[PDB]
Write a protein that binds this DNA or RNA. Structure first.
Ligand SMILES: Cc1c(N2CC[C@@H]([C@H](C)N)C2)c(F)cc2c(=O)n(N)c(=O)n(C3CC3)c12
Ligand SMILES: Cc1c(N2CC[C@@H]([C@H](C)N)C2)c(F)cc2c(=O)n(N)c(=O)n(C3CC3)c12
Ligand SMILES: [Mg+2]
Ligand SMILES: [Mg+2]
Ligand SMILES: [Mg+2]
Ligand SMILES: [Mg+2]
Lengths: 708, 690
DNA sequence: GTAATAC
DNA sequence: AACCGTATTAC
DNA sequence: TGTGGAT
DNA sequence: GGTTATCCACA
């Protein structure tokens, strides 16, 4: 696990804790082996301020750090016996690296304080940028850390340099690594020093401790959701965890309150759609989709991307699947989906509707990490995806659980709230009565559903749909045909058979999964004279045949986390749809005005065709022809360009009644569009009309039944 | 590992051997659990005709078959006490599936013969097309299409309907028709001896509800299918451009995507998925590992891919995964693709039938020798070491001018291999031998030097090591020598290699026979090795053992083909244009009546027809005329056009001559070869001796 | 025992 | 992101 | 425990 | 291609 330096020298030797085996590799190659050791950290590092000292001892990483520094841990820690003068934390300069620096520091604090107090623990800063320039053989390069340092490089170099924005240590060669972050004579470091032992204890415990409330409050109060230098432990931990917190809150774990997507989902959709990988066209190798995503939009592991893509495709997790996938995309038994090298995929037809009108400038775009392509920050959302498909849900200081809903019900609620902005929950619940899990079952708790629909939190009960079949020999048989959302069929069955094997309740002959490609069925065969209600009851209480589902509805509203209920959600959707439909209408109106202008021009041209040809023949060149067109006949620039760039064959379709029809069509179109832009009510009707069109086209029956 | 049926019944119960854990998944999901069990075979199954009965017994996949079937193995096999009525092998309808069946069958012919003789072994044929078709013949009737690349693209519902359901499935039943003609077929195709296999392949492989098939037949079609493919479309290089198909697809795909030496690097994963989705229907690991090799300058003499990040090291440590790295084509790679846009090379459809791909690249330098190739197919394998680009080109140029040249003269320009890792190559006569027959055994030995140290001690210092040798294992193997005192005098071993140099120090003890030691290490560690030429390439769709002459000849032939093709293409462009310009020049002389005629016309179609009829314009001219933008009518400069007419004519003459005169053509070829040499030449690294 | 495309 | 097994040839 | 984007 | 550990919140 450890790559030891060549010669033991407690006075010079350095220990590099590197983020990941891959960068560990590069660093093994780039090091100076006389005095630098490498010790890769394979994945996120254990929070030694949250976990049991037991699990902490059993930890592969912690154990090998205690034993290569060779000074023991805890109160039995002797600085004098250490094997390194410098410990150096070298992570990507990304938010997850920020997180790792945090975790490692809270270990060196808790269990090796003397090393931190003696200023022996540093943090290496990899560069953020590399500027051009050249071409292949004759190509030069320089590095920068501050957007300011970058501005100064642009002064030199000049044109035509090109910036490479480093996304993490993985895109550096060993030669580049050494020169910029490992060479003692070249590198910028940070020395963690403790300035105030007191102020540093509270800082570490708030952020890294087991208690959630404090941390939530620390984040609410500090995070603004809108050579060698010293940093304090308090100040560093503050700044690094602040970055991670903000990031996984607004850009990883929680869905946007308008389209109900996490950023990775939005990118999966946007990418596949750009590439015309749509419901009406041939499937397409998953790996091809995943790589395009990873290359154009989402700078994270393929497995995160693929796994997300997969989930949006499983109809027992999504109420209305957004991706269709050919092949083994898993099962309710929780077995593993085929690797992205085996499967093909495309957008579902309904996904199309989440994306409807995206070409029409209806939604804010941001630059991507390459600064090479724009991507959308929210989708146009032609149905209220947050409630229909749900979300879940773990961040920092916040987590989220929102159950799926029946498309027709959600839309009915919305259409009501559109006519009646001030509607109370009691009334919306006549349209939207409760969750509809794609897996069906029975949902119990009208009261707790209101609580949740009102506060974002609530606890409801989900219970399996059962039936009793009689068998020959006078013996009964419990048959289960629907089970509760998010429950693994295979385990459930094992856990029930466990009840039989342990004879927890009397009367169980045999458990058998009898589910086949078209239908779920767990048969529980009872004995001769078993109290059949006694069994069913015990199984509800002591296995997941029946569970508690907990609403924790948190979404991102105006850039910040928000515990929210049916009303903040529905109105947020409505508000959003409003911005879009207006944007859309502005777009189409401008496009129609421009055309109308040309068409007006062509209509005049036709009546003076001969004069115009003569006049163009008479000009010297393109520009000259346009000026003569303007001056002699008062056409505008935009018309003149249009006229002068018609191809010759056009002087045959010299037909003005058909152009006049287009003119009329356009005036009428423009009138319709203007009315939408100019009157809230006309526009909300357009919204209601479209929402109804989607319900007609996609509605399906409830699956889950309701009881209180 | 096994998914067993619900009820035990040796009358109905079926055992499904599914290629892949992944399809094993679909299988488990799609079956009828009351009587169908699932055993996924996870990867290529062991050859039970080559391996020892030692390793055959320790085998994971073999064991669990001998234990799930529960009848015992080999001679202690009682069919009576079995567990299934039908053992059903179910793989991709691809070449590797074919191979897999082949390996299973040889297991069931060798260690459970009774089972195959009583016809309990079957072969599930999955559909080729989507309604579903199996024959390219049935597809004609169904067409009054998704072409399936494997079981993996199939939903569990579809699996059941097409190939698992006893009512809808099309099976093949394995039968032994001639117990002896069958022993020979299996022994020949799957046994230890290669020569009988090679011969079998040369004589048979033409490189151009329930039916019963013989074991001699099934193994014939199956192994021939895999053989041919593995020989043509995997392991061996095209003699012309030196690429194996995965490599050619890696380059063509990245090139198509503008991922070139002069442009910023793309994420390795994006490139790889593009290759996988567009051209190469195999696993990403293969594709990426290939991409990575082409980027390592201690394996290629002239790297075709530039990769940012951890792409491995001479110490043999794993390259970062494709999610970490980025890449682009190297400048020289550009030259392999030069002129591809010009119809200079044969294209074929891809599997998807969406895109055409090239079957050989233009190859402006002779890649096969420069970079070399290795090398393991069926009945054949290949090793061809890298050479120095200036030297290869010098040879080719001499040969262009002297087609019937002898190896001896050619070796004045191409003295022998030039390994990217340098070192010392010993053996001129074996080099000659290899250049003559494509087989040869030379010696490759490390660049050494002796540093004197304080205290009357000497130090042996390594600076280059043999091609294909792992630095780290070497350094370890030398140290073992020290630690076990096999030979005497080693004080310490130190790898002192840094980011910009290779250096291994062997410190010796006071008064230790430094030659004795150095000889010992040469013989007993890879400090010195024997490299073996076995130059096999693909010429005319078939494997050919070849030396320096057919290689150079084939390259020259190829270049001739490309240059001619290229020259036809440019000439046709120049002519299509000359023709139009003649048309315009005319039009200007009679501008007024043409505008009139178009004016009179009743639409584009009628206008073109009127131009042709009234003024003898051709279609192509008419088209051009009639799609001019109005502002064109402003110009009446016939002189600028006439200058273009002249330039096109000079151009056409020069091109025609290349097509019409062999000497002209070959001069061009030489001119271009020399430019490439001038641009990319670098000095020898490996020294020569005999 | 390796090498490098495949599973 | 490493680890694990196997086919194929040849020395 | 287990959930799903992350390393 | 499965397995193996972690973060983070909340029952
Ligand atoms: C399964 C399998 C292995 N193993 C490890 C154990 C062995 C068992 C004995 N079949 C299979 C193995 F050790 C390596 C791979 C592999 O590298 N790549 N790229 C793969 O795609 N697979 C899958 C076969 C396709 C691998
Ligand atoms: C390393 C590591 C693991 N392990 C198992 C042991 C453990 C110890 C803590 N290093 C690391 C592990 F068990 C699973 C993964 C993983 O699924 N995916 N997708 C990954 O990319 N990695 C790498 C971390 C990024 C994994
Ligand atoms: Mg990173
Ligand atoms: Mg329960
Ligand atoms: Mg296959
Ligand atoms: Mg040797």
């Amino acid at each position: 696990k450890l790559t030891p330096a060549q010669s033991k020298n407690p006075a010079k030797n350095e220990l590099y804790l590197v983020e990941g085996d891959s960068a560990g590799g590069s660093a093994k190659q780039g090091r100076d082996r006389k005095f630098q050791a490498i010790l890769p950290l394979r994945g996120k590092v254990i929070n030694t301020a949250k976990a049991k000292m037991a699990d902490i001892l059993k930890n592969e990483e912690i154990n090998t750090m205690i034993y290569t520094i060779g000074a023991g841990v805890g109160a039995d820690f002797s600085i004098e016996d250490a094997n390194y003068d410098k410990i150096i934390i070298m992570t990507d300069a990304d938010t997850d690296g920020a997180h790792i620096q945090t975790l490692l520091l809270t270990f060196f604090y808790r269990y090796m304080r003397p090393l931190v107090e003696a200023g022996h623990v540093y943090i290496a800063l990899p560069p953020l940028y590399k500027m051009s320039k050249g071409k292949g053989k004759k190509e030069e390069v320089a590095y920068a850390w501050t957007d300011g340092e970058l501005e100064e490089l642009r002064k030199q170099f000049g044109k035509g340099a090109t910036l490479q924005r480093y996304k993490g240590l993985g895109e550096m060669n060993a030669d580049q690594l050494w020169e910029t972050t490992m060479n003692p004579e070249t590198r910028t470091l940070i020395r963690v020093t403790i300035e105030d032992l007191a102020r540093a204890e509270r800082r570490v415990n708030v952020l890294m401790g087991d208690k959630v409330e404090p941390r939530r409050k620390w984040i609410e109060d500090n995070v603004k959701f809108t050579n060698i230098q010293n940093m304090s432990l308090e100040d560093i931990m503050g700044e690094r965890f602040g970055r991670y917190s903000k990031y996984i809150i607004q850009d990883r774990a929680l869905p946007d309150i308008r389209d109900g997507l996490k950023p990775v989902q939005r990118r999966i959709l946007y990418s596949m759609n750009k590439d015309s990988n749509t419901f009406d066209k041939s499937y397409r190798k998953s790996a091809k989709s995943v790589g395009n995503i990873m290359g154009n939009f989402h700078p994270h592991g393929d497995s995160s991307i693929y796994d997300a893509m997969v989930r949006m495709s499983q109809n027992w997790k999504n109420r209305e699947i957004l991706v269709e996938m050919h092949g083994n995309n898993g099962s309710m038994d929780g077995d593993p989906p085929a690797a992205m090298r085996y499967t093909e995929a495309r957008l579902s037809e309904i996904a199309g509707y989440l994306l409807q009108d995206i070409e029409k400038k209806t939604v804010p775009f941001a630059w991507n990490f390459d600064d090479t392509e724009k991507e959308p920050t929210v989708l146009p959302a032609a149905f209220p995806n947050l409630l229909v498909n749900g979300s879940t849900g773990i961040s920092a200081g916040y987590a989220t659980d929102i159950p799926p809903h029946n498309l027709a019900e959600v839309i009915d609620a919305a259409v009501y709230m559109i006519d009646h902005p001030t509607a109370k929950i009691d009334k919306l619940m006549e349209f939207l009565p409760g969750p509809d899990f794609p897996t069906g079952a029975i949902i119990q708790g009208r009261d707790e559903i209101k609580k949740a629909y009102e506060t974002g939190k609530g606890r409801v009960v989900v219970r399996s749909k059962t039936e009793i079949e009689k068998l020959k020999g006078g013996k009964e048989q419990i048959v289960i045909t629907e089970i509760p959302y998010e429950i693994n069929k295979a385990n459930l069955v094992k856990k029930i058979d466990d009840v039989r094997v342990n004879n927890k309740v009397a009367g169980i002959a045999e458990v058998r999964d009898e589910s086949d490609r078209d239908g779920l069925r767990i048969a529980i065969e009872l004995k001769k004279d078993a109290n059949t209600e006694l069994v069913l009851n015990y199984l509800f209480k002591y296995t997941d045949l029946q569970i508690n589902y907990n609403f924790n509805m948190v979404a991102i509203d105006n850039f910040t986390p928000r515990q929210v209920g049916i009303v903040p959600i529905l109105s947020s959707y409505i508000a959003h749809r409003r911005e879009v439909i207006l944007a859309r209408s502005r777009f189409d109106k401008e496009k129609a005005e421009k055309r109308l202008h040309i068409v007006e021009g062509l209509i005049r041209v036709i009546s003076i065709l001969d004069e115009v040809i003569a006049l163009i023949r008479a000009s010297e060149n393109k520009a000259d022809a346009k000026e003569n067109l303007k001056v002699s006949y008062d056409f505008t620039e935009e018309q003149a360009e249009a006229i002068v760039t018609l191809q010759l064959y056009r002087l045959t379709n010299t037909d003005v009644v058909v152009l006049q029809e287009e003119e009329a069509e356009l005036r009428e179109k423009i009138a319709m569009l203007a009315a939408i832009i100019g009157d809230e009510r006309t526009m909300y009707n357009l919204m209601k009309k479209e929402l109804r069109e989607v319900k007609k086209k996609f509605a399906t029956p409830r699956l889950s039944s309701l009881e209180d």
